[PDB]
């Protein structure tokens, strides 16, 4: 019976949210929701007003730590939720700019009896909080997809005698003119109920009801509207049987790849399941080795009862170095506070040689790693603390500046001893999205900044620019460069060629290398070792085109390979949703080929690795059945390509 559903839903959500979220965070959320004109959820948070300790050195009070613990803050890009992990009862999933594919509930996790509320914000963009109007993206929004179920099962589904209020999504900014709510089954499986908060979405069967999601501030919807997408009960038909398929019932992601000197191919990333070994808790890191004929030699899974991923991997020719973040305590390590970075070493046989966890009392992220020809290892990332030196934004003065990241690069020897750590940036956000060593002892770093780091930012409202830093063998800066348009420009990865020149790839919403074809476009930029910009190429379709994550590699012939996603017809006719794409360039920026592949469902490449004089590997993630039938939610895939023309080969030979 749906009698008194409004009172039952309000009391249940209020009870759970106010029990789980720290008072500091409730105070922050209530203030933001009131300011933004999305007040519906505020009355669900009944904790007392509490000082928000933006700069506390206590890891348990430091607000960046608290906010990160209960949130997935995504990027200015059109994002899949590449950071989702089943590590908390309540999670705020914030898509920001771009057309985001938002998921928070892993259908493959053991969540029986667990309270689970995912609070979704599809856009809710930074510009709302600008005191001065007129910003390029003020008032702009995108079509976000809120994933509340798939072909396999409804999400947040307790399937018991109650109204199923213990698990539910709450979407705070659903716009039926633009956004989509994805649901299991068909429209006859649901019933919409107008409530004080907005709309309740109930799964309905003979035995009763189960609350799937609440839409704050929207009423009078219809299950016949095109803003609901129903996925039925049957896994997608398989395409691309030539690909290697990696998947469990949980969310599985490849985020990176590399090759050793014998031509063995490695992939790795994060999984909510038991992929390389028995799941330790929430998301774990994992990696796998394949011989050059496509046979898997081993898979390994490691981490903690908290959340970690492999975000980068590189080889010294024999060993495999891996890097990422963790929210827990790794084996043979101590926590520094909040989330930390780590670097680990695996030998060719899959033995974990060591793992080094490093960081500060506050939030570190690390997405990148490189290995030089001497066998030294460099990680890179960003920190809210004072890792390589004092953070540019240390404490609150008379003028409040929101806590913010600086970039860092850390150098290690082959035994994991830290040789140095360099930290740099501006008073505002500076994130790292790239690290690459040359042959002469130097190392480059690259990323995004809201500030004026290597040049005056021309954005009127702190839109991102790209930055590049060259460090010497001792970690001292030789130069800082910055490039961009007045709009957002976002870098994903960098790499050097055999001459020591540095290349970066990203997306732009403006005219960076040329006239923007529409929406996001791809760019590739080249700088010389002395900091001079040589060229920027920009290309795309009228739709959304971008590299993603480990988006560049450079082979021994100085061919450049790029990869990412597109929802246009970039390398061919789009198969549906986003597809993966890859491209090859020469060292002068001439485009040699451009290919597109994927399923009718959401796909993106996440990594590209070229074998010298051998195959090209493009790997990524999918909601479709790529290689074989999807086992649950996100699965992963690797494609073996002819590097001369981008044509897909059978993975196994």
Ligand X SMILES: CCCC[C@@H](F)CCCC[C@H](C)Cc1cc(O)cc(O)c1
Interface residue list for ligand X (CB under 6 A): 29, 32-33, 73-75, 83, 92, 94, 119, 121, 126, 129, 402, 404, 428-429, 431, 450
Those residues with Cβ within 8 angstroms of residue 94's Cβ, 6 or more apart along the chain or in another chain: 71, 72, 73, 74, 121, 124
- Residue among 117, 95, 113 at smallest CA distance from 105: 117
- The residue (of 295 and 532) whose beta carbon lies closer to Cl ion is 295
553 binding Mg ion? (CB under 5 A): yes
Q: How far is CA 169 from CA 69, 103, 194, 212, 232, in A?
A: 18, 10, 16, 6, 20
627 binds, among Mg ion, ligand X, Cl ion, none (CB under 5 to 8 A by kind): Mg ion
In the complex, minimum distance from the CB of residue 34 to ligand X, in angstroms, rounded to a whole number: 10
CA–CA separation, 621 and 253 (whole Å): 6
The 373-412 site mask, x for binding Ca ion (CB under 5 A), equals -------------------x-----------x-x------
Transcribe 28-48 into DSSP letters: HHHHHHHHHT-GGGGGG--SP
In the complex, minimum distance from the CB of residue 178 to ligand X, in angstroms, rounded to a whole number: 19
Q: Does the annotation list 489 as a binding residue?
A: yes
Q: CA 202 from chain center: how many Å?
A: 30
238 binding Cl ion? (CB under 5 A): yes
CA–CA separation, 415 and 421 (whole Å): 16
Would you say 92 and 33 are in contact if contact means Cβ atoms under 8 Å apart? no
Would you say 227 and 186 are in contact if contact means Cβ atoms under 8 Å apart? no
In the complex, minimum distance from the CB of residue 508 to ligand X, in angstroms, rounded to a whole number: 17
497 binding Ca ion? (CB under 5 A): no
- The residue (of 450 and 584) whose beta carbon lies closer to Cl ion is 450
Number of residues that bind Mg ion (CB under 5 A): 5
Transcribe 233-261 into DSSP letters: SSPPPPB-TTSEEE--SS-EEEEEEEE-T
Q: 489 by DSSP, 3-state: which? A: strand
The 290-319 site mask, x for binding Cl ion (CB under 5 A), equals -------x----------------------
Q: Does the annotation list 372 as a binding residue?
A: no
CA–CA separation, 129 and 381 (whole Å): 26
The residue behind tokens 């570190």 is 364
The 445-484 site mask, x for binding Ca ion (CB under 5 A), equals --------------x---x-x------------------x
164 binding Mg ion? (CB under 5 A): yes
Those residues with Cβ within 8 angstroms of residue 483's Cβ, 6 or more apart along the chain or in another chain: 455, 465, 466, 489, 512, 525, 533, 536
623 binds, among ligand X, Ca ion, Cl ion, none (CB under 5 to 8 A by kind): none
What torsion, rounded to 10 degrees, do the Cα atoms 540, 96, 429, 457 define?
A: 50
211 binding Ca ion? (CB under 5 A): yes
130 binding Cl ion? (CB under 5 A): no
Q: Does the annotation list 551 as a binding residue?
A: no
Those residues with Cβ within 8 angstroms of residue 234's Cβ, 6 or more apart along the chain or in another chain: 151
- The residue (of 497 and 550) whose beta carbon lies closer to Ca ion is 550
144 binding Ca ion? (CB under 5 A): yes
Restricting to residues 553-582, name those near Ca ion by CB under 5 A.
553, 575-577, 579
Determine how many CB atoms are found less than 10 A away from the CB of residue 169.
27
282 binding Ca ion? (CB under 5 A): yes
Q: Does the annotation list 38 as a binding residue?
A: no
CA–CA separation, 616 and 614 (whole Å): 7
The residue behind tokens 């740099």 is 424
Q: Does the annotation list 464 as a binding residue?
A: yes
Q: 323 by DSSP, 3-state: which? A: strand
Number of residues that bind Cl ion (CB under 5 A): 15
223 binds, among Ca ion, Cl ion, ligand X, none (CB under 5 to 8 A by kind): Cl ion
CA–CA separation, 481 and 494 (whole Å): 14
Would you say 586 and 638 are in contact if contact means Cβ atoms under 8 Å apart? no
Q: Which range of residues in 21-29, 331-339, 349-357, 497-505 is near Ca ion by CB under 5 A?
A: 331-339
Restricting to residues 500-539, name those near Ca ion by CB under 5 A.
517-519, 521
Helices assigned H by DSSP within 161-265: none
Applying CB under 5 A, among 208, 294, 416, 500 the residue interacting with Mg ion is: 208
Backbone angles phi, psi at 129, to 5 degrees: -95, 5
- The residue (of 157 and 412) whose beta carbon lies closer to Ca ion is 157
CA–CA separation, 474 and 442 (whole Å): 9
The binding site comprises 68, 71, 75, 77, 79, 95-98, 100, 122-123, 142, 144, 156, 158, 160, 162, 164, 167, 178-179, 205, 209-211, 243-244, 248, 250, 252, 276, 281, 283-284, 299, 304, 306, 308, 337, 339-340, 360, 362, 364, 405-406, 426, 428, 430, 460, 464-465, 485, 487, 489, 493, 518, 520-521, 541, 543, 545, 550, 552-553, 576, 578-579, 599, 601, 603, 632, 634-635
What is the contact surface with Ca ion in residues (CB under 5 A)? Answer: 74, 79, 95-96, 98, 100, 122-123, 141-142, 144, 156, 164, 167-168, 179, 210-211, 247, 252, 280-282, 284, 303, 336-338, 340, 359, 364, 392, 404, 406, 425-426, 430, 459, 463, 465, 484-485, 489, 493, 517-519, 521, 540, 545, 550, 553, 575-577, 579, 598, 603, 631-632, 635
């Amino acid at each position: 019976s749906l009698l008194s559903a409004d009172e039952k839903i309000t009391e249940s959500l209020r009870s759970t949210l106010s029990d789980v979220l720290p008072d500091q965070l409730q105070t922050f959320i209530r203030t933001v929701l009131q300011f933004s004109g999305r007040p519906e959820g505020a009355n669900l948070l009944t904790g007392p007003n509490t000082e928000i300790e933006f700069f506390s050195q206590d890891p348990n009070k430091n607000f960046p730590n608290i906010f990160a613990k209960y949130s997935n803050v995504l990027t200015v890009s059109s994002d899949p939720n590449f950071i989702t992990s089943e590590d908390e009862e309540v999670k705020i999933i914030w898509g920001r700019h771009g057309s985001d594919s938002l998921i928070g509930f892993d259908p493959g996790a053991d969540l029986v009896g667990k309270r689970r509320i995912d609070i979704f914000l599809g856009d809710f963009i930074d510009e709302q909080f600008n005191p001065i109007p007129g910003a390029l993206n003020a008032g702009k929004s995108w079509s976000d997809r809120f994933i509340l179920g798939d072909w396999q099962k409804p999400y947040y589904f307790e399937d018991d005698e109650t109204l199923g209020l213990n698990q539910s999504a709450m979407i705070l900014d659903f716009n039926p003119n633009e956004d989509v709510i994805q649901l299991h089954g068909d429209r006859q499986d649901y019933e919409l109920v107008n409530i004080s908060l907005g709309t309740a979405i109930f799964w309905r069967e003979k035995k009763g009801y189960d609350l799937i999601g609440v839409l704050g501030g929207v009423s009078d919807l219809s299950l016949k509207g095109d803003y609901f997408e129903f996925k039925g009960n049957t896994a997608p038909k398989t395409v691309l049987k030539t690909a290697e398929h990696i998947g469990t019932a949980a969310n599985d992601y490849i985020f990176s790849s590399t090759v050793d000197a014998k031509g063995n191919f490695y992939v790795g990333g994060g999984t909510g399941g038991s992929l390389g070994g028995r799941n330790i808790g929430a998301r774990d890191a994992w990696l796998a080795k394949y011989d050059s004929n496509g046979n898997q030699r081993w898979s390994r899974q490691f981490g903690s009862t908290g959340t970690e991923s492999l975000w980068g991997m590189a080889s010294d020719g024999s060993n495999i170095y891996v890097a990422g973040n963790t929210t827990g305590q790794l084996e043979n390590n101590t926590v520094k506070g909040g989330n930390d970075a780590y670097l680990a070493k695996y030998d060719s046989d899959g033995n974990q040689v060591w793992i080094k966890q490093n960081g500060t009392y506050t939030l570190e992220e690390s997405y990148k790693i490189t290995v030089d020809s001497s066998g030294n290892i460099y990680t890179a990332g960003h920190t809210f603390g004072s890792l390589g030196g004092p953070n540019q934004n240390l404490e609150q003065g008379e003028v409040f500046e929101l806590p913010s990241t600086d970039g860092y690069v850390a150098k290690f020897d082959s035994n994991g001893n830290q040789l140095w750590v360099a930290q740099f940036g501006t008073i505002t956000l500076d994130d790292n999205w790239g690290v690459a060593a040359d042959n002469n002892g130097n190392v480059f770093a690259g990323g995004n900044t809201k500030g004026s780091f290597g040049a005056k930012n021309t954005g009127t409202a702190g839109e991102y620019d790209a930055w590049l830093v060259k460090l010497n063998k001792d970690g001292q800066t030789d130069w800082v460069r910055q490039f961009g348009t007045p709009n957002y420009d976002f870098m994903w990865d960098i790499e050097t060629d055999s001459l020591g020149d540095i290349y970066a790839t990203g997306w732009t919403l403006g005219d960076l290398g040329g006239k923007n074809a529409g929406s996001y476009d791809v760019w590739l930029a080249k700088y010389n070792t002395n900091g001079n910009q040589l060229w920027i190429k920009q290309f795309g379709t009228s739709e959304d085109d971008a590299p993603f994550l480990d988006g560049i590699d450079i082979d021994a012939n100085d061919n450049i390979f790029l990869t990412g996603n597109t929802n246009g017809n970039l390398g061919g006719a789009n198969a549906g949703s986003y597809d993966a794409w890859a491209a090859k360039f020469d060292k002068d920026g001439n485009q040699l080929w451009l290919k597109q592949f994927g399923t009718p469902d959401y796909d993106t490449a996440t990594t590209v690795t070229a074998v010298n004089f051998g195959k090209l590997y493009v790997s990524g993630i999918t909601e479709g059945s790529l290689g074989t039938t999807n086992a649950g939610s996100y699965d992963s895939w690797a494609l073996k390509l002819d590097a001369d023309n981008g044509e897909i080969q059978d993975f196994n030979s």
